[PDB]
Design a protein around this motif. Structure first.
Motif, PDB file in Angstrom:
ATOM      1  N   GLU A 190       0.829  -1.199   0.000  1.00  0.00           N
ATOM      2  CA  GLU A 190       0.000   0.000   0.000  1.00  0.00           C
ATOM      3  C   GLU A 190       0.865   1.251   0.000  1.00  0.00           C
ATOM      4  O   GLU A 190       1.884   1.289   0.684  1.00  0.00           O
ATOM      5  CB  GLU A 190      -0.902   0.030   1.235  1.00  0.00           C
ATOM      6  N   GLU A 191       0.450   2.268  -0.755  1.00  0.00           N
ATOM      7  CA  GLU A 191       1.062   3.597  -0.690  1.00  0.00           C
ATOM      8  C   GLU A 191       0.145   4.674  -1.282  1.00  0.00           C
ATOM      9  O   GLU A 191       0.228   4.999  -2.469  1.00  0.00           O
ATOM     10  CB  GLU A 191       2.443   3.606  -1.366  1.00  0.00           C
ATOM     11  N   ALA A 192      -0.739   5.205  -0.442  1.00  0.00           N
ATOM     12  CA  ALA A 192      -1.603   6.313  -0.825  1.00  0.00           C
ATOM     13  C   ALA A 192      -1.014   7.612  -0.279  1.00  0.00           C
ATOM     14  O   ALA A 192      -1.742   8.533   0.092  1.00  0.00           O
ATOM     15  CB  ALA A 192      -3.013   6.100  -0.290  1.00  0.00           C
ATOM     16  N   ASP A 193       0.316   7.668  -0.235  1.00  0.00           N
ATOM     17  CA  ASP A 193       1.058   8.812   0.282  1.00  0.00           C
ATOM     18  C   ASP A 193       1.998   9.307  -0.807  1.00  0.00           C
ATOM     19  O   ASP A 193       2.687  10.315  -0.645  1.00  0.00           O
ATOM     20  CB  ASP A 193       1.877   8.390   1.501  1.00  0.00           C
ATOM     21  N   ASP A 194       2.048   8.555  -1.903  1.00  0.00           N
ATOM     22  CA  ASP A 194       2.834   8.929  -3.071  1.00  0.00           C
ATOM     23  C   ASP A 194       1.936   9.597  -4.115  1.00  0.00           C
ATOM     24  O   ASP A 194       2.321   9.742  -5.274  1.00  0.00           O
ATOM     25  CB  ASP A 194       3.526   7.700  -3.675  1.00  0.00           C
ATOM     26  N   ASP A 195       0.732   9.990  -3.711  1.00  0.00           N
ATOM     27  CA  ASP A 195      -0.172  10.697  -4.617  1.00  0.00           C
ATOM     28  C   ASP A 195      -0.569  12.065  -4.071  1.00  0.00           C
ATOM     29  O   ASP A 195      -1.252  12.839  -4.742  1.00  0.00           O
ATOM     30  CB  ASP A 195      -1.411   9.856  -4.930  1.00  0.00           C
ATOM     31  N   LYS A 196      -0.146  12.352  -2.844  1.00  0.00           N
ATOM     32  CA  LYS A 196      -0.282  13.691  -2.292  1.00  0.00           C
ATOM     33  C   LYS A 196       1.029  14.423  -2.539  1.00  0.00           C
ATOM     34  O   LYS A 196       1.049  15.625  -2.806  1.00  0.00           O
ATOM     35  CB  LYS A 196      -0.608  13.643  -0.797  1.00  0.00           C
ATOM     36  N   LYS A 197       2.124  13.672  -2.465  1.00  0.00           N
ATOM     37  CA  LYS A 197       3.445  14.193  -2.765  1.00  0.00           C
ATOM     38  C   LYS A 197       3.514  14.494  -4.253  1.00  0.00           C
ATOM     39  O   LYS A 197       4.265  15.364  -4.694  1.00  0.00           O
ATOM     40  CB  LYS A 197       4.507  13.163  -2.393  1.00  0.00           C
ATOM     41  N   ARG A 198       2.715  13.759  -5.020  1.00  0.00           N
ATOM     42  CA  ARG A 198       2.638  13.929  -6.462  1.00  0.00           C
ATOM     43  C   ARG A 198       1.607  15.002  -6.795  1.00  0.00           C
ATOM     44  O   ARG A 198       1.644  15.609  -7.867  1.00  0.00           O
ATOM     45  CB  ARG A 198       2.264  12.595  -7.112  1.00  0.00           C
ATOM     46  N   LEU A 199       0.691  15.236  -5.860  1.00  0.00           N
ATOM     47  CA  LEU A 199      -0.326  16.270  -6.011  1.00  0.00           C
ATOM     48  C   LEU A 199       0.260  17.657  -5.766  1.00  0.00           C
ATOM     49  O   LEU A 199      -0.098  18.621  -6.441  1.00  0.00           O
ATOM     50  CB  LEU A 199      -1.492  16.015  -5.053  1.00  0.00           C
ATOM     51  N   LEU A 200       1.160  17.752  -4.790  1.00  0.00           N
ATOM     52  CA  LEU A 200       1.830  19.012  -4.488  1.00  0.00           C
ATOM     53  C   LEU A 200       2.703  19.456  -5.655  1.00  0.00           C
ATOM     54  O   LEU A 200       2.899  20.649  -5.879  1.00  0.00           O
ATOM     55  CB  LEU A 200       2.675  18.883  -3.220  1.00  0.00           C
ATOM     56  N   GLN A 201       3.220  18.483  -6.399  1.00  0.00           N
ATOM     57  CA  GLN A 201       4.049  18.763  -7.565  1.00  0.00           C
ATOM     58  C   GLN A 201       3.178  19.242  -8.725  1.00  0.00           C
ATOM     59  O   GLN A 201       3.681  19.714  -9.744  1.00  0.00           O
ATOM     60  CB  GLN A 201       4.839  17.510  -7.959  1.00  0.00           C
ATOM     61  N   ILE A 202       1.865  19.124  -8.551  1.00  0.00           N
ATOM     62  CA  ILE A 202       0.902  19.528  -9.568  1.00  0.00           C
ATOM     63  C   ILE A 202       0.348  20.928  -9.305  1.00  0.00           C
ATOM     64  O   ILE A 202       0.251  21.748 -10.218  1.00  0.00           O
ATOM     65  CB  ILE A 202      -0.251  18.504  -9.674  1.00  0.00           C
ATOM     66  N   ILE A 203       0.000  21.205  -8.052  1.00  0.00           N
ATOM     67  CA  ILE A 203      -0.547  22.510  -7.688  1.00  0.00           C
ATOM     68  C   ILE A 203       0.545  23.569  -7.566  1.00  0.00           C
ATOM     69  O   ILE A 203       0.261  24.741  -7.315  1.00  0.00           O
ATOM     70  CB  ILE A 203      -1.352  22.445  -6.377  1.00  0.00           C
ATOM     71  N   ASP A 204       1.795  23.150  -7.740  1.00  0.00           N
ATOM     72  CA  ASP A 204       2.920  24.075  -7.750  1.00  0.00           C
ATOM     73  C   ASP A 204       3.591  24.084  -9.118  1.00  0.00           C
ATOM     74  O   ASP A 204       4.625  24.721  -9.312  1.00  0.00           O
ATOM     75  CB  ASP A 204       3.932  23.719  -6.660  1.00  0.00           C
ATOM     76  N   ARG A 205       2.992  23.363 -10.059  1.00  0.00           N
ATOM     77  CA  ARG A 205       3.454  23.361 -11.439  1.00  0.00           C
ATOM     78  C   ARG A 205       3.325  24.772 -12.001  1.00  0.00           C
ATOM     79  O   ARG A 205       2.370  25.482 -11.690  1.00  0.00           O
ATOM     80  CB  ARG A 205       2.628  22.377 -12.267  1.00  0.00           C
ATOM     81  N   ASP A 206       4.289  25.177 -12.821  1.00  0.00           N
ATOM     82  CA  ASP A 206       4.320  26.538 -13.349  1.00  0.00           C
ATOM     83  C   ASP A 206       3.196  26.810 -14.345  1.00  0.00           C
ATOM     84  O   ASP A 206       2.254  26.027 -14.471  1.00  0.00           O
ATOM     85  CB  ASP A 206       5.673  26.830 -14.005  1.00  0.00           C
ATOM     86  N   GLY A 207       3.303  27.930 -15.050  1.00  0.00           N
ATOM     87  CA  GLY A 207       2.327  28.294 -16.059  1.00  0.00           C
ATOM     88  C   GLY A 207       3.000  28.894 -17.276  1.00  0.00           C
ATOM     89  O   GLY A 207       3.822  29.803 -17.150  1.00  0.00           O
ATOM     90  N   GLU A 208       2.663  28.385 -18.456  1.00  0.00           N
ATOM     91  CA  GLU A 208       3.233  28.915 -19.689  1.00  0.00           C
ATOM     92  C   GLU A 208       2.753  30.348 -19.929  1.00  0.00           C
ATOM     93  O   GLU A 208       1.665  30.729 -19.497  1.00  0.00           O
ATOM     94  CB  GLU A 208       2.889  28.016 -20.881  1.00  0.00           C
ATOM     95  N   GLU A 209       3.571  31.134 -20.623  1.00  0.00           N
ATOM     96  CA  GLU A 209       3.306  32.555 -20.833  1.00  0.00           C
ATOM     97  C   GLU A 209       3.094  32.830 -22.321  1.00  0.00           C
ATOM     98  O   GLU A 209       3.385  31.975 -23.158  1.00  0.00           O
ATOM     99  CB  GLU A 209       4.487  33.377 -20.298  1.00  0.00           C
ATOM    100  N   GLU A 210       2.569  34.012 -22.643  1.00  0.00           N
ATOM    101  CA  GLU A 210       2.436  34.469 -24.026  1.00  0.00           C
ATOM    102  C   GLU A 210       2.203  35.979 -24.074  1.00  0.00           C
ATOM    103  O   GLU A 210       2.599  36.650 -25.026  1.00  0.00           O
ATOM    104  CB  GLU A 210       1.293  33.740 -24.744  1.00  0.00           C
TER     105      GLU A 210
END
Length: 511
Positions: free
Chosen positions: A1-21
């Protein structure tokens, strides 16, 4: 079991950058934007059904859903494409999100809705404005906005802004569509505004905004005035105003709120059904107390008393007013007018205008013992009140004659000039007579005529006695009164204007 490697992976998502134009959105940029909005709204709804107890599993779809709504504020820049928001069911979707389980989402669309319905924005496109407003009203925005309003915590700033933005929306639609004030009020808004006003919270800027919206909803809308009566709103208004009977408002924004309530109160007294309500709610006693205290609210209290006793349907209030010792309060104001040293109050003409409108209402409505008590006021102290009535008569007859002389002179000048006297010229003339003090003078003459018909010889004698020893004629008064009787009861049945015309004119005989 590891439902703790998807919050650590979630934080990497909500802190993902944003492309510019970039270039102003066209119909295809909006189309692309709406499809994304429907795409993200569908995924979020679906994920909240699938994992109702696991927020981590649906919060990146909710972050996405919130991002697109923020992004859609740009659509307000070009209201020509509002038809797209309607055709592609973006408006039906947005209204549904008002009842989203997360308060952060519903707040976001309220912010978007107010930006879209900005008054200056709506006038940029008559065609695009109509289609949007029609979708909002048919989809019942006010009903849904109120429902969402009931679950907002104002101790939280982001949600306090939501309450404000909700009100901002209705102030916008009611300005673009005054016809929807009735529908909006009956969809729970008026009911809510009343609750929010009598809520036992400190005075914030949202209470000021509520008082402001309420006045708008009652503005020349008899249907909403009756609605405020059924909801026991007269009591709420009186209770809120009773704070300022002995004390002045602390801030300046609280003083404006006090005036917005006074506006709503007078606006409600325009409806005859609210006269008895104002009476049962002990409004007369309150207003009378404010006149005795002589605080800031002394000016508007006088205005309210005038609106309460005016006309046929103010006859019950007239009799009660005398009962609660109203006479000892009103006549000092009749003898001397309070001075404007402050900034926020009535002028001298406006003061004397309401007092004379009050006495004229009493003389028209009072009967029995109460009428005798009023007439006795004119006899006491060697009829000093009659002397006072004549002093006012000559003051406004003087101002009126000066204006009339200037007006008639311009008529002559226009004739030689060759200029035709228009109907929008004669209306310009009528305005010059009004602020010269026409309405005041007419009440002064009605009062004079009514107390000379009281069969009290000391009064009738004193009137004639003063009239000629100064030079003015009893005939000037008769002229003013015929003119007064003619333009009467504007806004009432033809039957009414006919019978009141007869009644007033009958006072010219036996005068």
């Amino acid at each position: 079991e590891e439902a703790d490697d998807d919050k650590k992976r979630l934080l990497q998502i909500i802190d993902r950058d944003g492309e510019e134009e970039e270039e102003p959105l066209d119909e295809s940029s909006v189309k692309k934007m709406i499809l994304t909005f429907e795409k993200r709204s569908y995924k979020n709804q679906e994920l909240r059904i699938k994992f109702p107890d696991n927020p981590e599993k649906f919060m990146e779809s909710e972050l996405d859903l919130n991002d697109i709504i923020q992004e859609m504020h740009v659509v307000a820049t070009m209201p020509d494409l509002y038809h797209l928001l309607v055709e592609l069911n973006a408006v039906q979707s947005l209204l549904g999100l008002l009842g989203h389980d997360n308060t952060d989402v519903s707040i976001a669309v309220v912010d978007l809705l107010q930006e879209l319905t900005d008054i200056d924005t709506l006038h940029e496109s008559e065609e695009g404005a109509e289609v949007l407003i029609d979708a909002l009203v048919d989809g019942q925005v006010v009903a849904l906005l109120v429902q969402n309003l009931e679950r907002l915590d104002e101790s939280v700033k982001e949600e306090a802004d939501g309450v404000h933005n909700t009100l901002a929306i209705v102030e916008n639609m009611a300005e673009f569509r005054p016809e929807m004030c009735t529908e909006g009020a009956q969809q729970g808004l008026l009911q809510w505004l009343l609750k929010r006003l009598k809520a036992k919270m400190p005075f914030d800027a949202n209470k000021l905004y509520c008082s402001e919206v309420l006045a708008i909803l009652l503005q020349d809308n008899d249907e909403n005035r009756e609605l405020l009566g059924e909801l026991d709103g007269i009591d709420v208004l009186l209770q809120q105003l009773s704070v300022f009977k002995r004390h002045n408002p602390s801030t300046a924004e609280e003083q404006e709120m006090m005036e917005n309530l006074f506006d709503s109160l007078c606006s409600c007294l325009m409806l005859s059904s609210n006269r008895e309500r104002f009476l049962k709610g002990e409004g007369l006693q309150l207003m009378n107390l404010m006149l005795r205290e002589k605080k800031i609210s002394r000016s508007s209290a006088l205005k309210v008393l005038d609106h309460a006793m005016i006309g046929p349907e103010g006859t019950d209030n007239c009799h009660k007013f005398v009962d609660i010792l109203g006479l000892r309060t009103i006549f000092p104001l009749f003898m001397k007018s309070p001075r404007k040293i402050k900034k926020v109050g009535t002028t001298e003409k406006e003061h004397e205008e309401h007092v004379c409108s009050i006495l004229a209402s009493l003389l028209r409505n009072l009967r029995g013992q109460q009428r005798t008590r009023l007439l006795n006021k004119f006899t006491e102290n060697d009829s000093e009140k009659v002397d006072r009535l004549m002093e006012l008569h000559f003051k406004y007859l003087g101002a009126m004659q000066v204006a009339d002389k200037k007006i008639e002179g311009e008529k002559h000048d226009m004739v030689r000039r060759g200029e035709i006297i228009d109907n929008d010229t004669e209306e310009e003339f009528y305005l010059r007579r009004l602020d010269a003090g026409l309405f005041v003078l007419q009440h002064i003459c009605y009062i004079m005529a009514e107390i000379c018909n009281a069969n009290v010889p000391q009064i009738r004698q004193r009137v004639h006695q003063i009239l000629n020893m100064r030079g003015s004629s009893i005939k000037i008064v008769r002229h003013i009164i015929k003119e007064y009787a003619e333009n009467i009861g504007d806004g009432r049945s033809p039957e009414f204007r006919e019978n009141e015309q007869k009644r007033i004119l009958g006072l010219l005989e036996n005068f």
